[PDB]
Design a protein around this nucleic acid. Structure first.
Ligand SMILES: Nc1ccn([C@H]2C[C@H](O)[C@@H](COP(=O)(O)NP(=O)(O)OP(=O)(O)O)O2)c(=O)n1
Ligand SMILES: [Mn+2]
Ligand SMILES: [Mn+2]
Ligand code: NA
Ligand code: NA
Length: 323
DNA sequence: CCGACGTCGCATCAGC
DNA sequence: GCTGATGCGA
DNA sequence: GTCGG
């Protein structure tokens, strides 16, 4: 419908982030691309698009050029640019951001092939990102996500039956596919007022049954790694997937569950309705805003519905949280 | 005009 | 060796 | 790049 415009803006967004290192221009282009993608008409002019929140003068100008020529001169130019295109591409490797990609291209390292010839110049994360470059860019069918959930909940309960684990993200919202697996973990012995090994014992077990295959980062509260479903007999093996496991205190668990379930826009909207009701919501707590704007102590939470009631909101199932 | 634009855990770097 | 900054992907 | 105080 407006795919040409949105693809154009998305591509401009990446070059800003990865090449120009302008994170705010990156978000600006993506916000404009998002608001246009939801627009239910084929855009006839830049002036028409400028009415949308996130589309200003510059983008309205760029849209006019695209509509009249079928392309953007600047975008066509940076596409052909060997240095810029290589920098932007290298950032597709997990662990290689704008800064690392810049350094690599500066010293002649421009392709995955070049990265493969230069392992010693890559850190642990970047090696894993390189190894699973293809797998990481694939999506995960819900059926596989269900099998992944089966393993996680089973092994977690096996370590300690008092653990509470919840797979959040787009999966919990009931999406037909997901980009990764977000696991939230808590235990009755862990509160805010509070063992340093609650997360480790879970990771260890998942590694023992060969579910977790690699580790990108691991601390006392947050694990980021790689997992893979078991090979079904003599059939083709499953792609490696990204998995995060977060250990959250019991009293902050459901604010965490609410947040990490999403979606992006839903959180933004829910934070807005909360503020107009005199409440502030982060990933940890929900707090009442005093008469002068001072935030008081965090209110007790025992479920998602508690937060919904606090701001006088009708509870919405994760299924209906796309926005 | 000009500052905000989310904030943070972990790995690793820079400086001392 | 320690501390704070930076990069990175959330 | 866009918005808004
Ligand atoms: N911009 C962001 C990023 C993260 N989040 C918190 C809520 C997002 O819905 C959520 C989970 O992040 P995510 O996995 O990167 N995105 P999401 O699960 O919606 O998409 P997939 O990666 O599962 O395809 O974390 C947020 O509210 N806003
Ligand atoms: Mn996710
Ligand atoms: Mn995620
Ligand atoms: Na990257
Ligand atoms: Na990337």
């Amino acid at each position: 419908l407006n795919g040409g415009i949105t693809d154009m803006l998305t591509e401009l967004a990446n070059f800003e982030k990865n090449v120009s290192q302008a994170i705010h221009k990156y978000n600006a282009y993506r916000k404009a691309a998002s608001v246009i993608a939801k627009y239910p008409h084929k855009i006839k002019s830049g002036a028409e698009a400028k009415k949308l929140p996130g589309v200003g003068t510059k983008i309205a100008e760029k849209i006019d050029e695209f509509l009249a020529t079928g392309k953007l001169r600047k975008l066509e130019k940076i596409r052909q640019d060997d240095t810029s295109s290589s920098i932007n591409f290298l950032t597709r490797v997990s662990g290689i951001g704008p800064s690392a990609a810049r350094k690599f291209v500066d010293e002649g390292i421009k392709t995955l092939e070049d990265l493969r010839k230069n392992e010693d110049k890559l850190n642990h994360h970047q090696r894993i990102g390189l190894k699973y470059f293809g797998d990481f860019e694939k999506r995960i069918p819900r059926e596989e996500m269900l099998q992944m959930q089966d393993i996680v909940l089973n092994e977690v309960k096996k370590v300690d039956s008092e653990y509470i684990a919840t797979v959040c993200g787009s999966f919990r919202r009931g999406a037909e596919s997901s980009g990764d697996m977000d696991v939230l973990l808590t235990h009755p012995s862990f509160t805010s007022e509070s063992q340093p090994k609650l997360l480790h014992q879970v990771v260890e077990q998942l590694q023992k049954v060969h579910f977790i295959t690699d580790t990108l980062s691991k601390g006392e509260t947050k694990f980021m790694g790689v997992c893979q479903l078991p090979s079904k007999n003599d059939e083709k093996e499953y792609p490696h997937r990204r998995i995060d496991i977060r250990l959250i205190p019991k009293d902050q668990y459901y604010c965490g569950v609410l947040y990490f379930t999403g979606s992006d826009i839903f959180n933004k909207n829910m934070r807005a309705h909360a503020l107009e009701k005199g409440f502030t919501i982060n990933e940890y707590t929900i707090r009442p805003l005093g008469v002068t704007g001072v935030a008081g102590e965090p209110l007790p939470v025992d479920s998602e519905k508690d937060i919904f009631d606090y701001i006088q909101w009708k509870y919405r199932e994760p299924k209906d949280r796309s926005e």
